[PDB]
Design a binder for these strands. Structure first.
Ligand SMILES: [Cl-]
Ligand SMILES: [Cl-]
Ligand SMILES: [Mn+2]
Ligand SMILES: [Mn+2]
Ligand SMILES: [Mn+2]
Ligand SMILES: [Mn+2]
Ligand code: NA
Length: 325
DNA sequence: CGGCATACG
DNA sequence: CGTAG
DNA sequence: GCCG
């Protein structure tokens, strides 16, 4: 088992679901306390289990697996022995974990804001609504639409949104394309949002495109909230005799950068962090969603496809459905 | 022990 | 500070 | 929390 998640296929569904979910609780809780190092280890350990070809049934099978030390192995051991890990359950029912989870899940609220609110004694969404003066417009939108935003987005929703986004993109710039990215491109059947990447085959023509797209969507009455090259919106999506709010991300990239932006926005989050860590520490190259930089020769790699980027990095190609780290 | 990805709004 | 993957 |  390779040590980096970008070195191994990770499918969406796998054979160690309960074990990975428990480790991801501890990863999430570490993040709520500001321990990014422990978050990463628990995240990576969970991902290793997702990449295994069969269920872990005995502690023996953890020997030699990367990112499994005393702590993560003890968690697995207790789940194998008793069906439950005391530490995980303690986190699950803790007021701290439940409130930080509820607060951080609000669009516009991060760990730092949630932690300050928790220390001030706030615990519920209605606690936040009673004092709008402290909220940002982004937070007021996140709380107003929180219920809809907690409802899964389905594939049917995605196809309708894509058609509507394409319509506005086509008027903003004939020839521009819209590509579905994010978790749906990795094969997920549901999601908490929809991600689109927009480009144009003639380098430079995409300049200034996103404001034109947004104004067109705004004039169609489809934008419940919006704030450039990245736009984090809340869309009004038709429903049976009504509608629901849906988070939509729109991103523009010139065609020269499109493979890097496609790679980055297709995820997963852990996959991209591991890919960038691998790039820098193993290959000495600096990777982001704009390009891949050789800091010795001071040159950018030209890529025409995601396949090109994997080749540049000496990695076997992984389709999006195997990037579910 | 130091590192832990790297951007934009 | 928030956002993204 | 784990790796190198
Ligand atoms: Cl840490
Ligand atoms: Cl970037
Ligand atoms: Mn026991
Ligand atoms: Mn997404
Ligand atoms: Mn840019
Ligand atoms: Mn998104
Ligand atoms: Na949030």
């Amino acid at each position: 088992m390779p040590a980096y998640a970008c070195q191994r296929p990770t499918p969406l569904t796998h054979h160690n679901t309960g074990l990975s979910e428990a480790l991801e609780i501890l990863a999430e809780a570490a993040g709520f306390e500001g321990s990014e190092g422990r978050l990463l280890t628990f995240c990576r350990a969970a991902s290793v289990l997702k990449a295994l070809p069969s269920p872990v049934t005995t502690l023996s099978q953890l020997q030699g697996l990367p990112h499994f030390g005393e702590h993560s192995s003890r968690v697995v051991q207790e789940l194998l022995e008793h069906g439950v890990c005391e530490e995980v359950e303690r986190v699950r029912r803790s007021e701290r974990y439940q409130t930080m989870k509820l607060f951080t899940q609000i669009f516009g609220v991060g760990v730092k804001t949630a932690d300050r609110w928790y220390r001030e004694g706030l615990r519920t969404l209605d606690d936040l609504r009673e004092q709008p003066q402290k909220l940002t417009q982004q937070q007021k939108a996140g709380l107003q639409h929180h219920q809809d935003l907690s409802t899964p987005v389905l594939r049917s929703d995605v196809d309708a949104l894509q058609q509507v986004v394409e319509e506005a993109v086509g008027q903003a710039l004939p020839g521009a394309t819209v590509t579905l990215t994010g978790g749906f491109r990795r094969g997920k059947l549901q999601g908490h949002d929809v991600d689109f990447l927009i480009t144009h085959p003639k380098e430079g023509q995409e300049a200034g495109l996103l404001p034109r797209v947004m104004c067109r969507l705004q004039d169609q009455g489809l934008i419940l909230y919006h704030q450039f090259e990245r736009s984090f919106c809340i869309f009004r999506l038709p429903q049976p005799g009504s509608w629901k709010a849906v988070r939509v991300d729109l991103v523009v990239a010139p065609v020269s950068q499109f493979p890097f932006a496609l790679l980055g926005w297709t995820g997963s989050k852990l996959f991209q962090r591991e890919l960038r860590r691998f790039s820098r520490k193993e290959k000495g190259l600096w990777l982001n969603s704009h390009g891949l930089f050789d800091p010795e020769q001071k040159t950018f790699f030209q890529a025409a496809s995601e396949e090109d980027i994997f080749r540049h990095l000496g990695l076997e190609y992984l389709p999006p459905e195997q990037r579910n780290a």
